[PDB]
Subunit: 106 residues, 4 copies
Amino acid sequence: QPVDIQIFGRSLRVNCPPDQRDALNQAADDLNQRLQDLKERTRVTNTEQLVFIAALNISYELAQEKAKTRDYAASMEQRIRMLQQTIEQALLEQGRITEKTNQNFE
Amino acid sequence: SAQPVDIQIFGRSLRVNCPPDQRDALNQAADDLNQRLQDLKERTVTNTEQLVFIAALNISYELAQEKAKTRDYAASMEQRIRMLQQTIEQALLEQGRITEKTNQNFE
Amino acid sequence: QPVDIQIFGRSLRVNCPPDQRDALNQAADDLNQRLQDLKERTRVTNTEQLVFIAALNISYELAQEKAKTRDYAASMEQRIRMLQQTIEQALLEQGRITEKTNQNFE
Amino acid sequence: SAQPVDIQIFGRSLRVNCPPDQRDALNQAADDLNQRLQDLKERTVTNTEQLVFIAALNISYELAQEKAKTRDYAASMEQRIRMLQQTIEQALLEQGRITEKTNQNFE
Ligand SMILES: [Cl-]
Ligand SMILES: [Cl-]
């Protein structure tokens, strides 16, 4: 539903269901802080310029974060495979040892 | 390193300082943003500036969600490690308990 | 307490607590069968000869069985160490990945 | 291979057929048995034959107990493997559940 959002001296209108209002307010706070930080460190003063740069940075951040998620999953997958591999080893070793028959002399 | 790169976002030219080893990421980010702004435009009085603000809000939210995914992975894995580590201590306890046994005789 | 045990036509007396009587009867059955088996396969017919050979064989069996126990334990110890090693790997990998900070352009 | 070896057990000479690669085990078994019979003798009318019967009973019992140890190890390990394998399937289930998540947007 329609919501008016304030960011960096600007007034936005965003359509947003109630169960996403809180997410919207956080994103507004996040972006507000991003623009204020970007500014104090890059000497750029124009607001439109700042928002293009911030949008670019944050797209790149999202790309990185998505790579991180893939990397986490790929890594833990490998650990799970090793755990599995340790299990079949335990079973192979158990078979090897227990299947030995005690010898006699005659 | 790090020189200005001329980037075209949605009918706007802007300069971004960027080292060569990030250039490819910069090209991909501009491509991602351009596609995002275009798809947003057809979905929605499109002052380009306000359009970029809305795109940036969406990306902020998506980033927050993406970060929650790894947080959620980590939280699950924390439980898995706990269970594994107890199984390990129980195996150690059991190994000790059985190895301690002494055979008896009759006489 | 005193118990009279019958093995291979011979009459033994063995001092044995009640909570070991059942073990004694099994050992008597085990040995009875060992002597009957040893005989059908080695053509030795003297009983005293048979029992010396059986006692020798079974000492060797016990040595082997004790080695088996040591081998089982040593092997499973190694599996436990690998399980442990997989855990610190999961934690090292987690640290490596999660401690990466998303970069920006400016 | 396998020739007769002259073994002395407790004042008795006997021949045991034994290949070279078991000779060392045979020497150790005769040494073990000799020590066993001697320790049993001081503990106990010592017809040597009856003494060997009693030694053999003790060894049979000790063997049964020793075998029970590995049986007991194996039984414990069976439980440990079960717990590990459930942790593994739960990790797989959890990995799937989290990776399936899709980021939402506002507009
Ligand atoms: Cl968007
Ligand atoms: Cl004994």
